[PDB]
Design a protein around this ligand. Structure first.
Ligand SMILES: CCCCCSc1ncn[nH]1
Ligand SMILES: CCCCCSc1ncn[nH]1
Lengths: 168, 170
């Protein structure tokens, strides 16, 4: 029943609410959307055996955030790479067929120890689903890392995203 | 260490690199800047006795992020409120007179347990500096909370921001 890779246009469709349906998970649209394509997604395998996503974002100097962050010293904001990981975990929940709107619930340790310059080519996200809880509220817990051109730069442990039937 | 409150235009000046000077801390400019004003900043008091910042962001429905996040369900992204806390801690380091460019280093527990709708009036940030380290790299550790119209919605423990001179590597 399941598609395992998505193009930018599949994601934009999701952003309109047309991939998972109305009242279900949506990715944000530009300029908040931090994913160009989902290269792989399954509910088996991964670090913990409970699924995995691999996603990419193409970089070029003209990306909007580089001009305002910072003047004379462009660099992609860490919060945006962080948010991509939440975006992806949300996407995963909706992709599993669960109903409701997505909201990030937070995380454990987050680390930034590198940066994305405008001279980079591609950012890649790797997410490992640790647990899904299907009680009175439905939620996913995952670890994620963000890499730029092969090199690992951010990490986030215990990312939490939850789904809300009635919008918190 | 002298001025204890800043206006939006002080912050835009900072964003140009004209408040703390070249090679020192800068806030980002719009649309990444998540602060309209810093209502209070000192290096004494706060939760831990090592300083405090209180800052505000005015909300209105036409803020850019509401239109793309999400279509049919606008809500301020949590990462942006989070980033405001890092922006503020960075600002604090430069305001103390330390040299170097700011980079968020991460945090411990982050919690989102409410939201900012476009019908809100004002987001307020409260940051408590826990520790500053002035070793070979200079950095600040702080807890912060984000509130909307009086109500507490996000919290971040162990926010870390560090300063990087022209010799310091990333
Ligand atoms: C203090 C302003 C927060 C923006 C910096 S985001 C960042 N990228 C790599 N490290 N940190
Ligand atoms: C499902 C997409 C993940 C982004 C939700 S961002 C958020 N807004 C208020 N709390 N958290």
């Amino acid at each position: 029943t399941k598609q395992h890779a998505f193009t930018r246009e599949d994601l934009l469709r999701c952003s309109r609410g047309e991939l998972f349906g109305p009242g279900n998970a949506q990715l944000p649209a530009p300029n908040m959307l931090m994913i160009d394509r989902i290269v792989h997604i399954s509910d088996v395998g991964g670090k913990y055996g409970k699924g995995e996503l691999v996603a990419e974002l193409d970089i070029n100097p003209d990306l909007w955030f580089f001009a305002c962050h910072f003047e004379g010293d462009p660099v992609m904001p860490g919060c945006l790479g962080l948010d991509a990981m939440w975006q992806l975990v949300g996407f995963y929940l909706g992709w599993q067929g669960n109903p409701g709107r997505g909201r990030a619930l937070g995380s454990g340790e987050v680390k930034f120890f590198g940066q994305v310059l405008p001279t980079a080519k591609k950012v890649t996200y790797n997410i490992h689903i640790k647990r899904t809880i299907n009680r009175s509220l439905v939620l996913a817990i995952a670890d994620g890392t963000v890499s730029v051109d092969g090199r690992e730069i951010y990490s986030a442990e215990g990312l939490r995203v939850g789904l809300f039937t009635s919008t918190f």
